[PDB]
Scaffold this motif. Structure first.
Motif, PDB file in Angstrom:
ATOM      1  N   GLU B   6       1.714   4.690   7.922  1.00  0.00           N
ATOM      2  CA  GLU B   6       3.143   4.949   8.039  1.00  0.00           C
ATOM      3  C   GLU B   6       3.585   6.094   7.133  1.00  0.00           C
ATOM      4  OE1 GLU B   6       1.867   1.973   7.363  1.00  0.00           O
ATOM      5  OE2 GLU B   6       2.245   0.786   9.172  1.00  0.00           O
ATOM      6  N   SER B   7       4.662   6.761   7.543  1.00  0.00           N
ATOM      7  CA  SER B   7       5.201   7.912   6.835  1.00  0.00           C
ATOM      8  C   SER B   7       6.710   7.948   7.035  1.00  0.00           C
ATOM      9  CB  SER B   7       4.563   9.222   7.315  1.00  0.00           C
ATOM     10  OG  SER B   7       5.127  10.343   6.654  1.00  0.00           O
ATOM     11  N   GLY B   8       7.411   8.430   6.017  1.00  0.00           N
ATOM     12  CA  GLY B   8       8.857   8.453   6.021  1.00  0.00           C
ATOM     13  C   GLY B   8       9.452   7.234   5.339  1.00  0.00           C
ATOM     14  N   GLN B  39       9.925  -6.680   6.999  1.00  0.00           N
ATOM     15  CA  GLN B  39       9.923  -7.844   6.122  1.00  0.00           C
ATOM     16  C   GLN B  39      10.955  -7.611   5.029  1.00  0.00           C
ATOM     17  OE1 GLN B  39       6.104  -8.759   4.496  1.00  0.00           O
ATOM     18  NE2 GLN B  39       6.738 -10.743   3.667  1.00  0.00           N
ATOM     19  N   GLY B  42      12.388 -12.321   0.511  1.00  0.00           N
ATOM     20  CA  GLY B  42      12.662 -13.741   0.591  1.00  0.00           C
ATOM     21  C   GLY B  42      12.519 -14.371   1.957  1.00  0.00           C
ATOM     22  N   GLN B 112      -0.192   0.165   6.177  1.00  0.00           N
ATOM     23  CA  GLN B 112       0.161  -0.162   4.806  1.00  0.00           C
ATOM     24  C   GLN B 112       1.648  -0.422   4.680  1.00  0.00           C
ATOM     25  OE1 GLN B 112      -1.417  -1.373   1.584  1.00  0.00           O
ATOM     26  NE2 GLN B 112      -2.514   0.584   1.682  1.00  0.00           N
ATOM     27  N   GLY B 113       2.440   0.096   5.614  1.00  0.00           N
ATOM     28  CA  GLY B 113       3.867  -0.118   5.613  1.00  0.00           C
ATOM     29  C   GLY B 113       4.588   0.906   4.763  1.00  0.00           C
ATOM     30  N   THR B 114       5.900   0.971   4.961  1.00  0.00           N
ATOM     31  CA  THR B 114       6.721   1.867   4.165  1.00  0.00           C
ATOM     32  C   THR B 114       8.017   1.164   3.793  1.00  0.00           C
ATOM     33  OG1 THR B 114       7.700   4.080   4.033  1.00  0.00           O
ATOM     34  CG2 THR B 114       7.900   2.907   6.129  1.00  0.00           C
TER      35      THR B 114
ATOM     36  N   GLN D  39       4.818   4.342  -4.098  1.00  0.00           N
ATOM     37  CA  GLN D  39       5.190   5.106  -2.912  1.00  0.00           C
ATOM     38  C   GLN D  39       5.773   6.440  -3.353  1.00  0.00           C
ATOM     39  OE1 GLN D  39       8.692   3.796  -0.266  1.00  0.00           O
ATOM     40  NE2 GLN D  39       7.162   4.476   1.230  1.00  0.00           N
ATOM     41  N   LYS D  43       6.748   9.487   1.966  1.00  0.00           N
ATOM     42  CA  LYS D  43       5.510   8.962   2.527  1.00  0.00           C
ATOM     43  C   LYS D  43       5.459   7.451   2.334  1.00  0.00           C
ATOM     44  CE  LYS D  43       2.671  11.917   0.438  1.00  0.00           C
ATOM     45  NZ  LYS D  43       1.383  12.591   0.113  1.00  0.00           N
ATOM     46  N   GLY D  44       4.458   6.825   2.945  1.00  0.00           N
ATOM     47  CA  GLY D  44       4.348   5.381   2.927  1.00  0.00           C
ATOM     48  C   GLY D  44       3.892   4.788   1.601  1.00  0.00           C
ATOM     49  N   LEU D  45       3.805   3.458   1.609  1.00  0.00           N
ATOM     50  CA  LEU D  45       3.297   2.679   0.486  1.00  0.00           C
ATOM     51  C   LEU D  45       1.792   2.852   0.313  1.00  0.00           C
ATOM     52  CD1 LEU D  45       4.952  -0.885   0.324  1.00  0.00           C
ATOM     53  CD2 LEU D  45       5.280   1.059  -1.169  1.00  0.00           C
ATOM     54  N   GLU D  46       1.344   2.772  -0.939  1.00  0.00           N
ATOM     55  CA  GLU D  46      -0.075   2.710  -1.266  1.00  0.00           C
ATOM     56  C   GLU D  46      -0.302   1.561  -2.236  1.00  0.00           C
ATOM     57  OE1 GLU D  46      -1.930   6.329  -2.505  1.00  0.00           O
ATOM     58  OE2 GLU D  46      -3.887   5.389  -2.845  1.00  0.00           O
ATOM     59  N   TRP D  47      -1.300   0.728  -1.953  1.00  0.00           N
ATOM     60  CA  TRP D  47      -1.622  -0.375  -2.845  1.00  0.00           C
ATOM     61  C   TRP D  47      -2.400   0.159  -4.040  1.00  0.00           C
ATOM     62  CZ3 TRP D  47      -6.940  -2.094  -3.186  1.00  0.00           C
ATOM     63  CH2 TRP D  47      -7.130  -3.123  -4.119  1.00  0.00           C
ATOM     64  N   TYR D  95       6.331   0.093  -8.050  1.00  0.00           N
ATOM     65  CA  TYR D  95       6.993  -1.164  -7.762  1.00  0.00           C
ATOM     66  C   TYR D  95       6.093  -2.331  -8.150  1.00  0.00           C
ATOM     67  CZ  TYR D  95      10.605   1.265  -5.100  1.00  0.00           C
ATOM     68  OH  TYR D  95      11.651   2.075  -4.721  1.00  0.00           O
ATOM     69  N   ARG D 100       2.988 -13.924  -1.831  1.00  0.00           N
ATOM     70  CA  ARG D 100       3.095 -15.321  -1.434  1.00  0.00           C
ATOM     71  C   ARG D 100       1.728 -15.857  -1.023  1.00  0.00           C
ATOM     72  NH1 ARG D 100       6.627 -15.114   4.020  1.00  0.00           N
ATOM     73  NH2 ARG D 100       7.651 -13.363   2.953  1.00  0.00           N
ATOM     74  N   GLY D 106       0.629 -11.164   2.051  1.00  0.00           N
ATOM     75  CA  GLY D 106       1.797 -10.316   1.992  1.00  0.00           C
ATOM     76  C   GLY D 106       2.720 -10.587   0.823  1.00  0.00           C
ATOM     77  N   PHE D 107       3.846  -9.883   0.877  1.00  0.00           N
ATOM     78  CA  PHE D 107       4.860  -9.848  -0.165  1.00  0.00           C
ATOM     79  C   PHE D 107       6.141 -10.547   0.271  1.00  0.00           C
ATOM     80  CE2 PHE D 107       2.631  -5.633  -0.738  1.00  0.00           C
ATOM     81  CZ  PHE D 107       1.876  -6.041  -1.819  1.00  0.00           C
ATOM     82  N   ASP D 108       6.853 -11.126  -0.696  1.00  0.00           N
ATOM     83  CA  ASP D 108       8.184 -11.663  -0.431  1.00  0.00           C
ATOM     84  C   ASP D 108       9.263 -11.178  -1.394  1.00  0.00           C
ATOM     85  OD1 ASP D 108       7.000 -13.009  -2.481  1.00  0.00           O
ATOM     86  OD2 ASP D 108       7.264 -15.021  -1.633  1.00  0.00           O
ATOM     87  N   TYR D 109       8.916 -10.752  -2.609  1.00  0.00           N
ATOM     88  CA  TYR D 109       9.893 -10.184  -3.532  1.00  0.00           C
ATOM     89  C   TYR D 109       9.253  -9.069  -4.349  1.00  0.00           C
ATOM     90  CZ  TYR D 109      12.884 -14.372  -2.764  1.00  0.00           C
ATOM     91  OH  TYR D 109      13.644 -15.383  -2.218  1.00  0.00           O
ATOM     92  N   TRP D 110       9.961  -7.945  -4.446  1.00  0.00           N
ATOM     93  CA  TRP D 110       9.600  -6.818  -5.297  1.00  0.00           C
ATOM     94  C   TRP D 110      10.794  -6.457  -6.180  1.00  0.00           C
ATOM     95  CZ3 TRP D 110       9.702  -6.587   0.056  1.00  0.00           C
ATOM     96  CH2 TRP D 110      10.762  -5.872   0.625  1.00  0.00           C
TER      97      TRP D 110
END
Lengths: 54, 120, 54, 120
Positions: B6-8, B39, B42, B112-114, D39, D43-47, D95, D100, D106-110
């Motif tokens: 993903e991008s943006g 997502q 919570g 990976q999501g954004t 991030q 651009k997108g997220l990176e772990w 971040y 969870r 996956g994630f639920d709170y950041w």
């Protein structure tokens, strides 16, 4: 309604080398005076060609 | 070795507009139906939008009908999502997912999501 | 093809309470998926309505 | 309700080092697994890195193994990440995220995130 109008509408809407202001400007010109649509298409293409890089 | 990226996305004030991009690789991409999911903090996953393998069939949810728009370029292996009239609830992590066998068999590869944050 | 698309385009061009980013955003939505032309206009006119200080 | 805040971070010259801290509140900090992700704008997220609830299980990504380090203090409700040998590509908004039901779910709170800029 005018068949000359809408074909130039879709022509200018899909012109790649213009930016959003020029696209919306020439398209608004197609609305204000539907008799000049042909001429409007000529000067947009002319600009679009001259603003394309290689 | 399927891979999506993903991008943006980023910080924008409420009422603004964004455009997200998804770059796929290592498969045909014009044979699979694609989808966007988000997502919120919570809450569980929430489905957003989907597009057919060829295009010409687009599916949307009700929380975002009339505000988002989905499109795909099968010659560049790319999938776009256009966001408009953004609200504070739309802040989330957005994911780009490939559906195997249509809406019938679920998702098999994610991105990976954004992140999209909407505040003032 | 779709005349509702072109009419919603000219509808959005003349909305006063939008700024250039929102106007171009709804126009981009009309570009990506022309089937939602009615729905986009509904949410565009709504937003324009909320941005008037009258 | 759950609340996370990032702290630390700023401008450093290339080759330098920083240290980020994350303060959690309003939930049991020693039962959930935590992670740091970044991030860049547009651009997108990176772990980046992750640690188990108790510690003693640490996972890092491939772009930064041996350069960053993760740790947690379950008695202070705090989570740390130290960055070293920073390069110009490492600039992003970092971040602090809670996973969870383990790692792969996956994630639920950041948190709100913080900025790390590396330039000359």
């Amino acid at each position: 309604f005018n068949k000359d109008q809408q074909s130039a509408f879709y022509e200018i809407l899909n012109m790649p080398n213009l930016n959003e202001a020029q696209r919306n400007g020439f398209i608004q010109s197609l609305k204000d005076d539907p008799s000049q649509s042909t001429n409007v298409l000529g000067e947009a293409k002319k600009l679009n060609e001259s603003q394309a890089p290689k | 070795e399927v891979q999506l990226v993903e991008s943006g996305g980023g910080l924008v004030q409420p009422g603004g507009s964004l455009r997200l991009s998804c770059a796929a690789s290592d498969f045909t991409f014009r044979n699979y139906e694609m989808s966007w999911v988000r997502q919120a903090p919570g809450k569980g996953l929430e489905w957003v939008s989907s597009i057919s393998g060829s295009g010409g069939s687009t599916y949307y949810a009700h929380s975002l009908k009339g505000r988002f728009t989905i499109s795909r370029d099968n010659s560049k292996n790319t999938l776009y999502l256009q966001m408009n009239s953004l609200r504070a609830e739309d802040t989330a992590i957005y994911y780009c997912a490939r559906l195997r066998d249509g809406f019938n068999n679920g998702f098999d590869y994610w991105g990976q999501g954004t992140l999209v944050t909407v505040s003032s």
